[PDB]
Write a protein that binds this ligand. Structure first.
Ligand SMILES: *C(=N)[C@H](C[C@@H]1CCNC1=O)NC(=O)[C@@H]1[C@@H]2[C@H](CN1C(=O)[C@@H](NC(=O)C(F)(F)F)C(C)(C)C)C2(C)C
Ligand SMILES: *C(=N)[C@H](C[C@@H]1CCNC1=O)NC(=O)[C@@H]1[C@@H]2[C@H](CN1C(=O)[C@@H](NC(=O)C(F)(F)F)C(C)(C)C)C2(C)C
Ligand SMILES: [Cl-]
Lengths: 305, 305
């Protein structure tokens, strides 16, 4: 029993982290086979980053201008291209610790682990949701850029995030590993704000199922609702619409606990209308939306890698 | 910016995890050099665990009775002893992935990362506090026993916890790596409950400093208090006494923010007496006590391993 915010084990990703230095800018890179992927703004100075021309700054760099270090071993760059907002540095050495991997673009609502790195050295690991406004609620200092987010499925690491920047209110924005931003953000230092966020309804339901499984049951009411009736009340409290795909994805938790998704919807509608009256669920005084149905099943049925 | 529950990177510990099978019982072991450490109740059946005689059950085991697997490689046991509640199995192979390590017994109030493992395979990593009642608030299913808790200091893994059991209310109990229980718990299936818990005052203060650093400042009042006056109000809300050692440990955060520890004490006393009036701190509607002063500095100043 017990329910925790739980990251994937980071060992497979730790063996891929390197330091990339260009001019005086240092940040993190991801070394897979004979390629190092990092944020393209490594080729900028302070001045540059207000409104940089990246294609221009890159024309003017040799292979030798990029210093890539894995521990106190220097990798020799033998090639450099740009793909959207990501730099690819071909190196003379294939990373012998390359795991089985894929590059994935996740949807809003999906969780992943961040390995927070400084100078190519891992600082910590924590779990994050891609918010509907295409931000994450991370913990990143100066030098954290090139830190990656990932999922693990048995042996395969799916990389879905690379860290680029911090927005007002200390939320974070970044790219897939093909260098395309999540959301409408750009890699320059200008006025950018997140759209207002919404609550990921399917994740709150997944969390309510985790509470039931762990014996926290006080909020269960004796009522049902229609999907339509639920989605009208959800809308007022800035909750995402719940789709039929969402209902089908909650099937396993529903079948495990014997509570129909629309019965849990009735329970959530009451918590939204009446609040929690100073009571907690799984130790929390707020409804939690950063656990997916898959994360609840993992943790509550003990899936390993 | 941002403040997250953040685990240590688990790679160094992942390379030490093995599966231990004795009879039909399987659980996790920690393989360091040529020794595998696991919970001694691996030598029990269901029946045994109500009131087992461990010295007796062990007399009757050969080296060959212990099946130790690291992936799909079997390690040959060549020696077996018991140290308190932990089994030591000498094996024929030194673990080539053994990190620099120490065995440490932590004090109540201290945090660590748990690597939750099933069948010798890592499931997830999360951060935990040793509670004043000598429990942790973990997430452990059947087969999680032998899962370890650790801290990392640059290159050195300090192992401080091995998981043994779950107590009523789904809190967890275990040993140091010398096999001595934290708290008054025993490794048998009987009536055992945790003492009532208390709030780790020094950790709540560390967290309030993290809030200030992240720009969450609404709860700062214009008042000071005496240590004596603070500890009287703390006592009513089931908060630990704050000692002078606690004040000295908070010095760095105090000097960084320019708020005297006794000024933050005045701010916490007001939150305890008046509550939060429906406001949040670092996203939380409850005061958090599972970040140490060291954890706050790590995260807010970017320490790596
Ligand atoms: C890479 N190491 C940093 C990581 C940042 C620094 C503070 N915390 C983080 O997560 N990335 C940057 O410094 C990027 C970089 C230029 C500006 N920048 C920002 O994150 C800035 N943000 C913005 O300009 C805004 F508002 F658009 F989000 C900053 C003001 C420094 C927080 C580039 C190329 C985007
Ligand atoms: C080892 N894999 C398990 C881990 C447990 C199982 C459920 N979640 C966990 O964290 N350890 C045990 O099964 C230990 C084991 C016998 C009983 N046990 C317990 O944790 C039991 N607890 C207690 O008897 C009590 F109340 F004292 F805590 C159980 C009722 C199964 C939860 C031994 C040797 C202690
Ligand atoms: Cl909360």
């Amino acid at each position: 029993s017990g329910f925790r915010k739980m990251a994937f084990p980071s060992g497979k990703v730790e063996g891929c982290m390197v330091q990339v230095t260009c001019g005086t800018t240092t940040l993190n890179g991801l070394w897979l086979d004979d390629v190092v992927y990092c944020p393209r703004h490594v080729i900028c100075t302070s001045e540059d980053m207000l409104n940089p021309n990246y294609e221009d700054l890159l024309i003017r760099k040799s292979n030798h201008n990029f210093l890539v270090q894995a521990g106190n071993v220097q990798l020799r760059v033998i090639g450099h291209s740009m793909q959207n907002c990501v730099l690819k540095l071909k190196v003379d050495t294939a990373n012998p610790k390359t795991p089985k991997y894929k590059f994935v673009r996740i949807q809003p609502g999906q969780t992943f682990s961040v390995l927070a790195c400084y100078n190519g050295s891992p600082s910590g690991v924590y779990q994050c949701a891609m918010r509907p406004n295409f931000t994450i609620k991370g913990s990143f200092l100066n030098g954290a850029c090139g830190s990656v987010g990932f999922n693990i499925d048995y042996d395969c690491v799916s990389f879905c995030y690379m860290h680029h920047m911090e927005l007002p209110t200390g939320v974070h924005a970044g790219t897939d590993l093909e260098g395309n931003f999540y959301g409408p953000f750009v890699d320059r230092q200008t006025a950018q704000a997140a759209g207002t966020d919404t609550t990921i309804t399917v994740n709150v339901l997944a969390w309510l199922y985790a509470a039931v499984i762990n014996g926290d049951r006080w909020f269960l009411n004796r009522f049902t609702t229609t999907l339509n009736d639920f989605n009208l009340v959800a809308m007022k409290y800035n909750y995402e619409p719940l789709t039929q795909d969402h209902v089908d994805i909650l099937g396993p938790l529903s079948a495990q606990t014997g509570i129909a998704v629309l019965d849990m919807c009735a329970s959530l509608k009451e918590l939204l209308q009446n609040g929690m009256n100073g009571r907690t669920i799984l130790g929390s005084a707020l409804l939690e939306d950063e656990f997916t149905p898959f994360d609840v099943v993992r943790q509550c049925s003990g899936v390993t890698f």
